[PDB]
Ligand binder design. Structure first.
Ligand SMILES: Nc1ncnc2c1ncn2[C@@H]1O[C@H](COP(=O)(O)CP(=O)(O)OP(=O)(O)O)[C@@H](O)[C@H]1O
Ligand SMILES: [Mn+2]
Length: 478
């Protein structure tokens, strides 16, 4: 609207002045002297000092979601309201926690309950289902309410949300008839609210659902159940890019839209161009939460903190700069004097999936592990493949083994070829739904549901045998 456009204009130019005002509002409870004056691994001795007892520098936690997330949600609501019409069922999760937790700090906060409710903040899933500590029951509640409906934080969850429906349909069909939530749903909120949603039986929808679901092709399925949905909202940037092409098969190729970029430290900014395809999607940063200041180059509670993620400038309106996410620092694979990171992995798997694509297969998911047990220590990748023992092509993936190697840095290839520090790259083929079972492992181990993204390197190593157990075959380079 006029007000939204006006505000968006007021955010320009935010480069220095407004960011310095926010910096002053921060500091008080000039900027040159601060710059001449002013990581969590570094802050760990300093940050853990305030946790010294339970059952104090600053006041935890008024930061972030209070003054940040609601603003973002509303503004992006108005953005998609501007770029899309007719919009005037999302998957989010909370688990049992006095500590900062995921986006669940928002769901546990009164900014969520006192949230303005119009459309964007209105959902088909009962709010009791959202906060439900049982995410397995609450997911089924989301999918049942959806089955009756007439995106998420991360993309990695979305496919799983598609996965469950693949293994379960008719149970929902019996549930809508019974008017009761499934007997194995133990949550009071889920049970009650969902039973209320079901209410009277609806065989009319049940039969046509049964007719629609049985189709032999999974191509573009999710778009059929709710055609009126214009767009998907999930992060397709970063590692989550891995999940892009799979959706387009499962969907009608409706737009995949990444609205926001933020970390545990704070929320950074939002994407101002919904017209951006997943690869060019760019996050422009907000001045109010801004620190580290600002300006085609490579680059409250926290002052001059180092974020720990890598971004590049995708361009600008010249009023404010735009940024696309590339890689994250923390994840790295190494043997001797060789650092291989997220974007090198993505490079290699991009080189690899083009080989699989020619053989009549594809790649559902991947992750990595380095084996230091035996010399030479070699790079190991775990692949889960889909056809759109049984059907094994020795050549395709043994080609995929090599095609990843020369895609990586010559550093690796120095320790690989000539000097023998590392041996031939190994690919492990895992059976169906292995990565599904693997994410089930993490959640139960104290990992957020539901904040979930698939790690591309495994240090655990308690999760390692889970992939090992499911390996169908192994293939090597050279
Ligand atoms: N849209 C996006 N694209 C790419 N990366 C993102 C992103 N949004 C958030 N992130 C990254 O993901 C992190 C948010 O949660 P986490 O991934 O669990 C932090 P982490 O340090 O990678 O976890 P770890 O230290 O346990 O491995 C932020 O550090 C941020 O760098
Ligand atoms: Mn990360």
């Amino acid at each position: 609207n006029e007000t939204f456009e006006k505000q968006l204009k007021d955010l320009t130019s935010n480069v220095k002045s407004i960011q310095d005002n926010l910096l002053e509002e921060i500091i008080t409870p000039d900027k040159e002297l601060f710059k001449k004056n002013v990581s969590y691994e570094d802050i760990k001795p300093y940050l853990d000092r305030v946790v010294n007892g339970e059952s104090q520098k600053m006041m935890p936690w008024n930061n972030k979601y209070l003054d940040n997330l609601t603003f973002i949600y509303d503004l992006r609501m108005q953005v998609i309201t501007k770029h899309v019409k007719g919009v005037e069922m999302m998957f989010l999760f909370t688990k049992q926690e006095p500590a900062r937790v995921a986006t669940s700090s928002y769901f546990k906060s009164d900014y969520f309950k006192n949230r303005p409710s119009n459309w964007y903040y209105s959902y088909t899933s009962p709010d009791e289902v959202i906060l439900c500590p049982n995410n397995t029951e609450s997911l089924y509640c989301h999918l049942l309410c959806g089955l009756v409906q007439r995106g998420s934080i991360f993309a990695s969850v979305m496919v799983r949300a598609i996965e469950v429906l693949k293994n379960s349909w008719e149970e929902l069909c019996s549930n809508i008839r019974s008017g009761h939530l499934s007997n194995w749903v133990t949550d009071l909120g889920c049970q009650n609210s969902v039973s209320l949603v079901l209410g009277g039986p609806r065989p009319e929808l049940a039969d046509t659902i049964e007719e629609i679901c049985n189709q032999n092709s999974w191509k573009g399925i999710v778009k059929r159940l709710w055609p009126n949905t214009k767009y998907i909202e999930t992060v397709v940037t970063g590692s989550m890019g891995q999940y892009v092409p799979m959706l387009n098969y499962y969907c009608n190729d409706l737009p995949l839209v990444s609205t926001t970029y933020g970390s545990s430290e704070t929320t950074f900014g939002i994407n101002l161009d919904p017209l951006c395809k997943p690869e060019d999607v760019s996050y422009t940063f907000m001045p109010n939460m801004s620190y580290f200041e600002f300006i085609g180059c490579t680059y409250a509670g926290l002052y001059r903190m180092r974020v720990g993620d890598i971004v590049l400038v995708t361009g600008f309106y010249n009023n404010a700069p735009q940024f696309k996410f590339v890689r994250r620092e923390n994840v790295v694979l190494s043997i001797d004097s060789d650092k291989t990171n997220e974007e090198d992995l993505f490079k290699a798997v991009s080189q690899a999936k083009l080989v699989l694509e020619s053989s009549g297969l594809d790649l559902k998911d991947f992750t990595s592990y380095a084996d230091t047990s035996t010399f030479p220590g070699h790079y190991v990748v775990y692949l889960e493949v889909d056809t759109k023992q049984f059907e094994l092509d020795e050549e395709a993936l043994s080609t995929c083994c090599l095609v990843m190697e020369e895609s990586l840095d010559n550093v690796y290839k120095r320790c690989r070829f000539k000097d023998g520090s590392i041996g031939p790259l190994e690919i492990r083929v895992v059976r169906q739904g292995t990565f599904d079972s693997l994410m089930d492992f993490f959640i139960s181990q104290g990992a957020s549901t539901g904040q979930y993204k698939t790690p591309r390197c495994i240090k655990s190593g308690k999760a390692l045998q889970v992939l090992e157990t499911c390996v169908v075959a192994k293939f090597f380079s050279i």
